[model samples]
Structure formats: structure tokens, C-alpha cells
Target chain A: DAGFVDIPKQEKALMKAVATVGPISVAIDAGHESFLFYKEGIYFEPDCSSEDMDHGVLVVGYGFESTESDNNKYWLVKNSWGEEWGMGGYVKMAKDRRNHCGIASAASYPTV
Target chain B: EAPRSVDWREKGYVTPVKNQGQCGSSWAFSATGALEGQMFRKTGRLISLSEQNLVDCSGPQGNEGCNGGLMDYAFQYVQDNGGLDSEESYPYEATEESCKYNPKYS
Candidate 1:
């Protein structure tokens, strides 16, 4: 359960977020220096290592890191896009990424 | 008005940023992107924002540069950091608070 996530799967995840969330907005930061997030997701990084997360996004949810076993640890997620994606959006991430992109450091902003 | 400019995409500017996955460095990505864009639009020259610097320099304070952080959160990082530390000054570790160090190939 801990390994490299392939492209097709990433693509599938993208499609799933799109389908469940609906059409996403591809708007850059309003001031051309900031960023924007929507019901779909937010896109950032106009350049630089932009390949991996070229369409960088996040699915809103209230989840946390869980390590019930030495072989299990992930973002216990719950997606609104149905119970098809990662444990119904309740993924158990490897609890390794605590700084930001990983589990412990996960960040998001609710609609304001 | 002679027709509003239709080339906003071209007129617009952007900054280069990196994604520190699982490593929990979204704060770095957010901070860098905004600074890079602001710097470019003002200077018209692209400069790399130091993710390494953000990760190391930011420390673990209120997720200043946590993953999933937006450009707004990152902007505060810049404001607090007395501007970004140069890539030359702080090279990219790319994997957590400090792990590997690849020599500046540039």
C-alpha cells in the first residue's frame, strides 16, 4: 500500500475529482501573484517542478493520519465524490509527509 | 476603448515552484509561487524561489508552509522571512526538513 502512485491512477483520481466536484476553474492568483481555490480545486505553480502537480489540486475533507499497523499509515480521507476513490476518499497515507504535501502537513481552505 | 486586451495570458506573469510531496512542503510551494510572480511582474525576469529555504527557514510554526497551503498562506511566509532566501543561499533539499543536498548544477 506504500509505493509510487502511477500516472493512470493519478489521472483517474483527477477525473474522479472532476466528475464529483464538477468543472474546475483554472484561474491563476487574482493579483497574478497569488493563487485561487474553488469547489473543484486550486491550481498553482505556473512553472518549476510543475510537472508532478501541473494541475495541483486538493479535495476538501476532514481526515487525519492513522497508523494502526506497521504496514498501514495514510490520510484517512472521505471524499464527497462517492465511495470509489481511496477508501471513499478516506485514504490512509504513509503519514510521512508531515511538513506540507504529506499526511501530517495537509492544508486546505474552506469556501469563505 | 480599442477593445480590451485579449492577450491577458501573455500579459500575465507566473513563478516557478516545486511540489514537496509527502515531505509536507506545500507552504514552500505557496510562498515561492506568489513571490516569484510578484518578483517577475515587477522585474520581468524569472528567478527561482527557494523551497529549501522555506522548509528549513519556516520551521514548524502554524503550518507556514504546510502542504495544501494556498498562495495567501505562503505570501505571509515571504513577509515573515524578510523576502525569500536565494536558491544559491539555500539549495533544495526536496525531501523533508533536510535530507539530501544536490550541488547547484546550474
Candidate 2:
């Protein structure tokens, strides 16, 4: 259309280059839909480091802030309820926190 | 006839909004809801209204203020108040208080 502007160079590149990617068929805990769910076998660390720890959460997304106090990339995570309260709902942790958090025992959705 | 001091849509909706206490600011909810309805009717896609904006913007008499206000009174306030707060304008405070009249926009 005449009203359009800059088009894409690689259409698939946009979706592919996202900050994080979820494993398919890994049976996730889909309760809040905004959390990161895991059980056994699921990985959280940067390069899938630790073993799974039965836990469920909703992943908000990721962000990078550059200011005086902090200038680093962090993943926005949340917990069902924990010490990380606010960060529990929409948390901002080290991007590599997942890798550090370890492997998933299992991840499943909450049943209504 | 339209009221003398306010522009209701910009201020608040004339309809009574439900009380959402213990659930944060309802004022922000309505503002986002209003924009959502406007855009939804326009685009035909139900958008997640920015409740955060309303939660943050509604109460104060200054720029970006919305404490806790009644839906009906807010409508009247908005009519009298011009350029109501945006989500980014004010922050939300979930408390109940008397409606503060601001004739600055009057």
C-alpha cells in the first residue's frame, strides 16, 4: 500500500531471533500463561546447566536496561509466590538465571 | 447539553464503574477500558487495556494523578477536567477519599 514504510529483509528472522525459545512437547505448566513451568528434564540456565527442580512460574519476557545503577540484560520471571514477590509476578533476573536455576523435573499446567 | 466545565470523555466516562477495591485502582481500569473499547470498536480486536495506566494516573489534581474516585464523579470530573492523565502520567494509589474539585480546567 502507498501508506506503508520499511519492509522486512528476512521475514522468518524476526520470530527466530527472539531472546528466548521454548522447547516443544516438553509439557509445560500452563497455569498463569505468564509463567515459566518446569518439572524434570527442563532446563533454566544459560546453556541448560542444572538438574530439574520441581517449580512453576510464568515468564513475563526479557529486557535490558542501561543506566547509572544497573546496565545489564535480565529475564523477566515470576513465581507462584515466593521471596521474589514482585519479581515473582513480573521479575527481572539475570538472563542466565534460567541456566543457573537448573534442570526441570517436570512442567505441567494447572487444572481448572 | 454538555456540562460547562468538563469534557467527560477526556475526564471520565458518564457511566458508573464497578468498585474494584482490594484489587487496586478502578480509575486506571476504566481509562484503559475506555481506550480499549474505543480501539476495539475501531479495529475489531479486543485489546488488553492498560490497567496499569489507570491504576497509576487517576487520582491527583496535578499532572498524572488518580487516587481513588467514583466512576460517576470521575465522568463529571473528566468533563470538567481536560486532558486526563495517561497511564504514564500518574501512579496508582488504591485508597478512598473525597473527590477534589479542580477549577483549573474549568
Candidate 3:
């Protein structure tokens, strides 16, 4: 029972996994400008579809901004590119898009 | 129900950043990261596991060492390969090499 798993590629499953399971292994396009040079705030790379996945990250947690606009939900991601990138090796990707940069294309997490 | 907002980093469940220099082992780091989080939840201790272990031994599971791999493939390797080793035991070299796994570390 202690291994890795995919908790569905839907928003509901992602929310459940992030809250129930700790951090989830995720994939994304690391070469994108916003992802490479992200400093703060929610990161939404326009139309970051699931086709350009070239890097792996972790979904540490997620939250919804108190805004009435679109793309309010965000997933706090952990990167392997050292602490110099983003908010000390972390970035809040736009979670509402689900597969933004392929975050949900193949999300996996370990069980213990 | 899930909380509105939460960060494992603040709760001490998240580990520090690691540099994956000159290799396409991002998949290893990502999988190793989730494994550490799993260990923290079940054992209450945060330990740094070896990415090099997977980088070297996960080839049978479809991982191409430093060339590139996937999280599920690396995870499958660990599940069937008697778990994994710690960074203190196996360590990361950012480069692939022959497997030197020892059960004494487990």
C-alpha cells in the first residue's frame, strides 16, 4: 500500500489529494517565461496547455484568492530548480486551468 | 473537507531545495520529494532520500537515468525494489552510475 498513485486528473481530485495526501508530484513546462522568472503572485502562463510538459514539480498546497475574477484558484508548487527561483523554489500555478502546463496530466503522490 | 489554504512548507513537511545540475533527472527529484512527504506523514520524520538511487536503478522501470524519466516509473521502481535509501546512505551525484544499493541502509 505504500507506493505512488494518481488521484485523477480533475480539480476535485487534486483538491482532495493536496489536502489529504501531502505534496503531489507534478509535471509542467519549465521553459515558459512566467514559470522561469516567477517572483510572486499567482502564476498563469496564459494558455499553458498540457502539451508542453518538460519539467517536474510538486503540488504542496492550493488556495483560492478572494477575487471575483477568473483563475482565482491556485496551486502552491515546489520546484527542484533551487531556492533562487520563484518564491524560494516555490510558485502558485493557476489551478483553475487544471492542466495548465500539464500540472494534472500525470500528477502522482506517494503513500505510506 | 479540504482547507481553503495550506502550505506543507510552513508545517515542516516540506524539504529544502535541491540543485539538479546538468541532468534531466527532474522526474527523480519530483518523485523523491513526494516520497519524503509520505515518510513524514507516516513516520513523523523528514528524511532526504536518494535521487541517484532511482537515477541509476530505475532503468528497468522505464527511467533513462540522467537522460530523463517519469515519476510513476521511478515510484514503481521503489515500490518493487525494496523501498529506497537515504541521501546520507546513497546520496545524489547529479549523474547516473551503477547501482550500489545496500539493504543495511534500510
Task: Arrange candidates, best DockQ first.
Answer: 3, 2, 1
Q: Which has the greatest TM-score?
A: 3
Candidate 1 structure quality by residue, lDDT tens digits, A29-51? 12222222212211222331212
**Each model's interface RMSD (Å)?**
16.1, 19.9, 1.7
Provide DockQ values for all models, in the order shown: 0.02, 0.02, 0.68
lDDT of each: 0.35, 0.32, 0.84
Tell me the spans in candidate 1 whose CA falls farther than 4 Å from its real position: A1-112, B1-12, B15-22, B64-71, B98-106
- Provide TM-scores for the models: 0.37, 0.26, 0.90
Residues B1-106, candidate 3, lDDT per residue (tens digit)? 7788978877777789887888999999999899989889988999898899999998878999889999999888888887789888988888898886533354
Q: Which stretches of candidate 2 lie over 4 Å from their true place?
A: A1-49, A68-71, A82-84, A103-112, B1-106
Lowest lDDT 10-mer window, candidate 1 chain B?
B1-10
Chain A TM-score per model, please list them: 0.28, 0.38, 0.85
| Candidate numbers, best TM-score first, in rank order | 3, 1, 2
Better of 2 and 3 by TM-score: 3
